[PDB]
C-alpha cells in the first residue's frame, strides 16, 4: 500500500508521568503518526543527598516519553542528536521489526538527525531504548528509554471480551541507575563521559543498582507531583523497566486486571496483589479506585522502593467506604 | 448492610506451616470471621552456626500464622503490642482495600491494641506484613510478615471450570534475611534496635541475603518437621514472599495446577516444574502425590536453596510406582 | 503395561544448540526411547579473557543435549561415569516423578554407569540436572544442566487450538558461573575440585555471577555459529536456565507464542517483547521471521547479556521489507 495515500497525524509529546492526548477506540484509519524527539545529555540530581550524574534523555525526561498509537498505524520518529550532546546515539523500539528494532537503522552523531518509519503489528506497551553497539547497558541505565503503547483499534478487553476503557492513565518509568563507588562507599567525582566509562561498566558489573527511582528521581512522584485520582475513576498504570525486573504493587489497592508482560492480545491477570515486570518489557495494570486518601506505588522489593527510590504516591479524592474497611477499635492502651 | 446482623465465628490460628481448620466450599452466607495476633519480639536462631538475630512477629513465629476466609466475608483483627515489645507496629493486608491495606489505622506502640475490620473482596491468597512509616523494609525483612487466604465461595477451579478439593494444606513462608556483616564477613555483635537500625539498612542495601529460610530456620520442614503427604492425596502449598521473588520447585513432582501470583479468579497453569512468586505476593501450588520418598521443596535459585537455607522436605508414604520411574540397572562398574 | 512389549528407539544426540531429529506429531504409538549421555569433566575456556574453569558436563557440552520425547512415551538413559573423572554424578529430571527426579536411584562414581525408566507423563519443555547430595549447586553451576523436550502427541497447539509447526528449532542454555576471585577482583588461581570447593561456595554465596553465557562461553552463538533462519521460517528457541532468573528478547522480532515456563497444555503467551523464564525452568518461544539481517538474542538485563555474556545472534537471509520498517531520512546534518 502507498503509505503516502494515509493520513498524517502529528503527537505533541508530554514529560512524563502524564501521556498525551489520543483515543482508545480508533475514530480514523490506519495513519502515520508522526512524532519527533530531541536527545539531551544533561546532568540530573536524582537523590534527596543531591548526588548528580550524567543523565542521557529522550526529550529531556528519564523516562523518555510515552508514544501512543493503534495497531496497524505507521509511526514515523524524528530524532533529533543536537551538537550540544556528545556522544553517538540511536533508538531500538520493542514494537517494531526489523534492523535491531530500528536501532541499525538510526545512529545519529551530535550535530545529526534521522528519520525512521515503523508499522506497529502487535497491540500492547513495549519498550523503546538507546543502543549504540558496544555500550548498550551504560545508555539504557543512563535513563535512556521510554515506552511506546499500540492500543487495539476497538480498546482494551477484560478476559471475557467486554471493554475495559481508562479513565486516565499515567506512565511510570522505573531506572535503575549504577553511580561508581569507591572502596568505602561513596559515589565517584567523574570529568568525561569516556573517563567514566570503565568505572560505569564496574558499578553495572556488580549487578546491584544504587538508586532505584521512578519518574528520575527519588520522591520524583511526591508531594505537589503525586499522582492523582477520584473514587471511582478507572486508572491504567504503563510501568517499564528497560534493564531489571520489577514487581509493582498499589499499596491499598490492586491491579483488578494486569498485563504483567503488557501484550493486549492475551487476557489480563486478574485480582493482582503485585505482578513482575520483566527487565526489557512494560507492563500495564488497571484499577478502580474504592478508596480515598493517600496510596503508595511501589516496586515490591521494599528495599528497593524505601530505600533506593522505587516508590511513588496517588493521593485520592472522595467519600470513604467503612463496609469495605474501618477502625472498630481505634489504637488505645 | 447492618454488619452486625452477621454471624461471628472465631477462628483460634495455628502455627504454621500448619493452617486452621476452614471449609472450603462455604457452609454459611457471609460472616464477620474475628482473629486475634500477639506481636512478638523475639531471639531466634535462624542457622545450624547459631546465629541469632532480634525477629519481630506476628503470634510467635516466622512467618505469622496462614488466615483463611471467604470472598466476601468481613476480616475483624485484634491486633495486640503488649508493653514486653519496644517498636511500633501496624498490618498491612494486600487482600484488603483502602488505608494502605490496613497500616494507617492500625499503629500500636507497646502497650496498646487496636481492631481493623475490612471486607474480603477478592479471591486468593495474599500477603500481610507490618508496615510503620519510614522503617518498612526492616520490619518485613526481621519475620514480621504472613499470608491470607480468600477462598471462592464455591472453592477452587481448575482452568475448565471443574472443581479442584486439596485433601491437605500447607503454608510455606520464605524469609530473606539481611544480618550486617562486617569487613571480614562476620555477622556483627546489637545491643538495641537503635544501635542496629543503620547497619541493618546498609545490609538490606545490598540486595543480598546472609539467610532464605522457610518456617523461620535453616532446616525448621526437614527432619521430624518434613511435610507429610501419602501418595494419592491432593496437597495444597500456599508459599508466600513479602519482599523478594521466589521460584518453588518439587524435587521429584509438579506443581499439578498453580496461581503462581496467587489470585484465583484466574485460570491456573498446568503442569508445572518450577513457578515465580514476586516478591510482595502469595502463591499456590496443587499437587497429587503418585510416588512415595523424600522429596525436597525448594526455591530453585539452588544456591538460595542449599546454601541459604531455602529447601524443605516432604515424606510421603505408599506404593511406589515402576511404570511410572524405575532403575533398569543400578549403579555398577 | 508390559513395557518389554513396546517399541524401542534409539536416539543419537546432537551438540547444542542443534536438536536431534524428531516428529513432531507423533508417528508411532508410545514408545521406549533410548538414551546415552557420557559425563565428562573437562576444562573450558568462557570468556575472551581466556578465563579457564573446571567445567562438569553431560555429553562433553554446556548445556547438555537436548532430549525429545512425546507425552507418554517412557524415557530410558544410560548414564555413564568413565573412570578418567573424578566426581560423584547423578541426573534429575524435571519431566520424571518420584526419586529426585531420578537423582536418588542414578548415583555414579567414576567408572560406573547406570540406566533409569520414566514415564514422560507432562508435556512441555523441561530441565534436567546433576544433584549430588549435598554438593547440588556446584555441580550444576559447573555446567552440569540441559533440557528435555516432552511434545504433545499431536504436536503444538495455539491459544485457540490451532496447530503450530515449527520449521527449525534450536536449544540455548545459559548458565551462570560463579569464578571465584580474590580480594582485588581477579579469578583465582585451583589444583583439585576439593581445593575448589570452599572458596566456590562463597562465590556463589555472593548471588552475583560472573559470567551469564549462552552454549558456554561469551560469543558462543556468534560468527560462524550464528544462529540461521530465512524470511517467513517458524523457529522454535527452547531457553533453559537451571538456576537462575532469565528474561529472553529477541532485538528486532518478537515471541509471536511463547510459553514461558515451558508447559504445553498452557496457552501460549502472544506477542511478547521480553519473557521471564525463572531459574530452574525451561521456557520455548515460537517465531515467525519477517525481516532479515543481523539479530542479537539476549538476556534482557542488558548488562548481563553485553557485558556477562548473555547474547547470540541470529543471521537471517531474505527480503527486505520497507513497509514493515524502513529509513525515511537517513542519518545526516
Ligand atoms: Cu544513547
Ligand atoms: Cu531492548
Ligand atoms: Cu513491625
Ligand atoms: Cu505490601
Ligand atoms: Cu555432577
Ligand atoms: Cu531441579
Given at each position: 500500500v502507498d ?11 508530554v ?5 498525551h ?5 480508533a ?12 536527545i539531551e545529555?544533561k546532568?540530573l540530581?536524582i ?13 529531556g ?6 508514544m501512543?498509537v ?5 509511526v ?13 546515539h ?7 521489526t ?8 538510526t545512529?545519529?552523531?551530535?550535530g ?17 531504548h ?16 521510554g515506552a ?16 475495559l ?15 561508581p ?6 559515589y ?9 566509562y ?8 556488580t549487578?546491584?543498582?544504587?538508586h532505584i527511582v521512578?519518574?528520575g528521581?527519588?520522591?520524583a ?9 477520584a ?14 525486573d ?5 499499596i ?17 491477570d486478574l ?14 495494570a ?9 496510596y ?13 527510590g ?24
Open positions: 503509505i503516502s495515500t494515509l493520513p498524517r497525524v502529528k503527537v505533541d509529546l514529560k512524563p508521568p502524564f501521556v492526548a489520543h483515543d482508545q477506540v475514530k480514523t484509519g490506519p495513519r502515520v503518526v508522526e512524532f519527533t524527539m530531541t545529555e546532568k540530581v537523590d534527596r543527598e543531591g548526588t548528580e550524574i550524567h543523565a542521557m534523555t529522550f526529550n525526561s528519564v523516562p523518555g516519553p510515552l501512543v493503534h495497531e496497524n498505524d505507521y514515523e520518529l524524528r530524532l533529533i542528536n543536537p551538537d550540544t550532546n556528545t556522544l553517538l540511536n533508538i531500538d523500539f520493542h514494537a517494531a526489523g534492523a535491531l528494532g530500528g536501532g541499525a537503522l545512529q545519529v552523531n551530535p545529526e538527525e534521522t528519520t525512521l518509519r515503523f508499522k506497529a503489528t502487535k497491540p500492547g506497551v513495549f519498550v523503546y538507546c543502543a549504540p553497539e558496544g555500550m548498550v547497558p551504560w545508555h539504557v541505565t543512563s535513563g535512556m528509554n511506546i503503547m499500540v492500543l487495539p483499534r476497538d480498546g482494551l478487553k477484560d478476559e471475557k471480551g467486554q471493554p476503557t481508562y479513565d486516565k492513565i499515567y506512565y511510570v518509568g522505573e531506572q535503575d541507575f549504577y553511580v563507588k569507591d572502596e568505602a562507599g561513596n565517584k567525582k567523574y570529568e568525561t563521559p569516556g573517563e567514566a570503565e568505572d560505569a561498566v564496574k558499578a553495572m558489573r549487578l546491584t543498582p544504587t521512578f519518574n528521581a527519588v520522591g512522584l511526591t508531594g505537589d507531583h503525586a499522582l492523582t485520582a473514587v471511582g475513576e478507572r486508572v491504567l498504570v504503563v510501568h517499564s523497566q528497560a534493564n531489571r520489577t514487581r509493582p504493587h498499589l491499598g489497592g490492586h491491579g483488578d486486571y494486569v498485563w504483567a508482560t503488557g501484550k493486549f492480545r492475551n487476557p489480563p485480582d493482582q496483589e503485585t505482578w513482575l515486570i520483566p527487565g526489557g518489557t512494560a507492563g500495564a488497571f484499577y478502580t479506585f474504592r478508596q480515598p486518601g493517600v503508595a506505588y511501589v516496586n515490591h522489593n521494599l528495599i528497593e522502593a524505601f530505600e533506593l522505587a516508590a511513588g504516591h496517588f493521593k485520592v479524592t472522595g467519600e470513604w467506604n467503612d463496609d469495605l474497611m474501618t477502625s472498630v477499635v481505634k489504637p488505645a492502651s
